[PDB]
Design a protein around this ligand. Structure first.
Ligand SMILES: CN1CN([C@@H]2O[C@H](COP(=O)(O)OP(=O)(O)OP(=O)(O)O)[C@@H](O)[C@H]2O)c2nc(N)[nH]c(=O)c21
Length: 147
């Protein structure tokens, strides 16, 4: 009875009706309380991080990425941490060429912002994934070399 919506939606479990109401409440809280001030919004970031690993959808991924980056620019990094976990674990489970390009792009940005959370997640993807013949950004290769 006390199931959080994100827990219900992540069960083998997702319906549009439950997700619509949940997403709307989270976004409304982010708008009212402010970026980085809503713990409900944090549960939505976490939901996306896991849900997209098994049920990718382009528009949901794009919203996740956009809001995670907006939060991170203001200094609130949980969304982006969730996004890097999605990249590293999600692309290991099923490689996606377009999403991998985004993974490289956001890792480069994160490293150039003086963070290493993203770079470690990219390194981890390379250590765990069976993907071969990756076309890795030569600047990212330099960053990984020092890691
Ligand atoms: C199980 N893990 C762990 N991991 C990433 O790998 C990095 C190092 O964590 P770890 O591999 O769990 O350390 P590990 O040596 O296994 O733990 P321990 O030394 O206690 O035995 C973390 O950035 C973490 O997010 C992973 N990354 C991907 N893509 N897939 C995975 O299954 C895993």
């Amino acid at each position: 009875h006390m199931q959080h919506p994100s827990h219900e939606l992540l069960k083998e479990g997702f319906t549009q009706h439950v997700y619509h109401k949940y997403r709307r409440r989270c976004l409304n809280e982010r708008k009212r309380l402010g970026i980085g001030q809503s713990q409900e919004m944090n549960t939505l970031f976490r939901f996306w991080s896991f849900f997209l690993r098994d049920h990718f959808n382009k528009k949901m991924y794009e919203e996740f990425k956009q809001l995670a980056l907006e939060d991170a620019k203001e200094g609130y990094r949980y969304g982006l941490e969730c996004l890097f976990r999605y990249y590293s674990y999600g692309l290991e489970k099923k490689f996606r060429l377009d999403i991998f390009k985004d993974f490289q792009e956001e890792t480069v940005k994160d490293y150039e912002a003086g963070q290493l959370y993203g770079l470690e997640k990219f390194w981890a993807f390379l250590k765990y994934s069976k993907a071969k013949n990756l076309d890795i950004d030569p600047k990212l290769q330099e960053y990984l070399g020092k890691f």
